Design a protein around this ligand. Structure first.
Ligand SMILES: CS(=O)(=O)Nc1ccc(C(=O)O)cc1
Length: 167
């Protein structure tokens, strides 16, 4: 038994809810929240900017130090940093950005990072401003992630479409 409430069970291990992932992170304080990162960890908008704003920019300050030391992530890759006031840890995962021409086949690699964590609160990778089809992102998630993943979908319209079209 864990602290996640109001989710709808899609599979043995994947759960989904209509909620802002930022708001969800503040209530639950999960062990791991996933950020929809880019390779530079520049958290300007979307999930990353909303998460970063909720940390009062501390996520960005930590991220800038991480990049100064390590250089950019890979598309499909991740790093574990602090969860600040939102979670114990933030898993920054880089899905391919379709609006930059990145290989959608990298979405599976991106979701494989989730398997290193027993339980996660996450958004749909490569959805929103990253330009991928969220229906596709949910299919890759279900077919790739084996650990317990609690997906937050902010758009109520999209949430209902994801559920009603789920195979
Ligand atoms: C409402 S918020 O901007 O504070 N935080 C969010 C939540 C979800 C998304 C998304 O694209 O799914 C983007 C930002």
């Amino acid at each position: 038994v864990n602290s996640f409430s109001g989710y709808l069970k899609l599979t043995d291990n994947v759960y989904i809810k209509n909620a802002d992932i930022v708001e969800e992170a503040k209530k639950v304080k999960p062990t791991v929240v996933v950020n929809a990162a880019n390779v530079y960890l520049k958290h300007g908008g979307g999930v990353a900017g909303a998460l970063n704003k909720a940390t009062n920019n501390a996520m960005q300050v930590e991220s800038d130090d991480y990049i100064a030391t390590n250089g950019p992530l890979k598309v499909g890759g991740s790093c574990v940093l602090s969860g600040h006031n939102l979670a114990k840890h933030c898993l920054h995962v880089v899905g391919p950005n379709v609006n930059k021409g990145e290989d959608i086949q990298l979405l599976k690699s991106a979701y494989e990072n989730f398997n290193q964590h027993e339980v996660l609160l996450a958004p749909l990778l490569s959805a929103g401003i990253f330009g991928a089809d969220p229906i596709h992102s949910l299919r890759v998630c279900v077919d790739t992630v084996r650990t317990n993943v609690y997906l937050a979908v902010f758009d109520k319209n999209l949430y209902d479409k994801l559920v009603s079209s789920f195979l």
